[PDB]
Amino acid sequence: NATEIRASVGKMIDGIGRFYIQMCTELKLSDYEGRLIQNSLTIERMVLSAFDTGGPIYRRVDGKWRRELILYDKEEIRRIWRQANNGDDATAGLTHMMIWHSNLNDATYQRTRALVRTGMDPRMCSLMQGSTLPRRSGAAGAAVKGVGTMVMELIRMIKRGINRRTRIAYERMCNILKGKFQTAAQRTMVDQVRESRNPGNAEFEDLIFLARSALILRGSVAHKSCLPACVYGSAVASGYDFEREGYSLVGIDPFRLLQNSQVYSLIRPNENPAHKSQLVWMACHSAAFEDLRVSSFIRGTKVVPRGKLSTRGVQIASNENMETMESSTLELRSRYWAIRTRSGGNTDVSFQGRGVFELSDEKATSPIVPSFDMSNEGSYFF
Amino acid sequence: SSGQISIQPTFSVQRNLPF
Known part of the structure; x- marks a missing residue:
């Protein structure tokens, strides 16, 4: 039944999109400045706070980045939100960004x-x-x-x-x-x-x-691919009308969406861009505790361990300064995709027969089995 | 130590699960 489940969740995705767009239109941000995962975050939290305020907002002037500290009518936010969801509450929607934050924190x-x-x-x-x-x-x-x-x-x-x-x-x-x-x-x-x-x-x-x-006989824990508000905002703005075309959080939908996303991020002077993108990518799928081997396999490129990762966190602290601050374009594309599961496996090989899918393979038609005989780089992100 | 000891699976694939 691809009617309710696929389209009702599309409707919750439309809300986040629409809202993000409205909210960008208030802050009078630019296109590049609406794609800044930084600003997106701030907005997402402004909202979850108001439904349960102000925040850091980065602006682009000739050359350098200017951080604005701003505040909004906690209710105004709540007003704009419902406006986007048809005057509904769409707890699902808030809960969605509630997770995107989670999955980012479980990896950062x-x-x-x-x-x-x-x-x-x-x-x-x-x-x-x-x-x-x-x-x-x-x-x-x-x-x-x-x-x-x-x-x-x-x-x-x-x-x-x-x-x-x-x-x-x-x-x-x-x-x-x-x-x-x-x-x-x-x-x-x-x-x-x-x-x-x-x-x-x-x-x-x-x-x-x-x-x-559970370290040995794991349990069933669902994984939800929850992307930043900007990604959905941008998508909604590009015409994608998800409630009609359907969307998933455990299918090919989220990967496909991230195959065209133009997300930018603030990046400290000594940090490694490639390393930054990795982080975000792992938060987009709750892959913070996945086997690095497989993460890299599906990712398409090395998925380096946390220790060897060059970055302290995606949000910028009040401590830092903007003079020595610049921004890079986040690499969120992946090689293949995989059905984000819930099962912990049981009998040692798990998910016997389950494989990875090409990004063309829209349907779950043909699976691909990975062979890890290879010069890997670990299995424990932590 | 202070590190991981098992892997939480995020995808459905043929994978020896490490612990």
Whole structure:
């Protein structure tokens, strides 16, 4: 059923587009200045804040880049937003940029300070997918969460308590948790945890176990290809009418869109452009914990590890100066594409028979199997 | 250490999953 699912999500994409365009028209930005992932970000956050303000806005004058610090009527923003979505709320839409931010953060940063202070092993990176993602996120917002993500929550919810309505949360938070697991025991053991009203160290210690079980017997976690507002704004402006032509977040749609995107980014004096593009690209598909081998395979070019990556973050801090600042064009194109999955595999070869698709192969017709016998460069982005 | 130990899979392909 390609009617609701493909076209209803198109309608949520149209909203973000339309809105971004309107909002650019207010700031009186240029074309080059609307394609600046920097400005796009600021706008996206202005909105999520207002639906739950001001921000950094970079301008282009003869030669150099000027940063403007601006503020907007928190309600005006909310007004312009609905205008774009037909006066609807389109929580999906806000939630979408809620993820784009997530997926960018799960790749720009490593959240160790928090894992340990919770009592999780820092080496449990690959399980913290969406730890940044506000609880306000929707139902299809939590499905993107890693097993480890859930644990850090319950453990804190439990840790402060064990140190009214709060109960329905805990059980559900576990049901979700449990719905991540895809094996008998895994599934059953989650229940044995959900049994205690005041679950103390008994649970505290047990879930941590299950956290580690997922390192081997992974769960089902959905991945959503969520592109920056500018990319959708630009697309909408170019005529693409997604609600009518359909769109996906786990199909070929997102890759294809990024095959023509003209996104620019601010880049510090000593940073490597190629390295910058890599980052953004990995946030566009939630590939921050993917096997570097495969990421590079599909990417088309080396996908260098975080340590060897030359960049500190895409957003520009108030500390820095503009004099020594310039901007590059982000390389977001990829070689092939792949069905962003949810499954963690089980039996060691996973996704037996599943392959990669050419960017011409619109339909999922002919699959391609990668052979990794090769001089690779690692598997752990972190 | 302080590094990764397993790979979270993002795509559907024939891939030995590292841990």
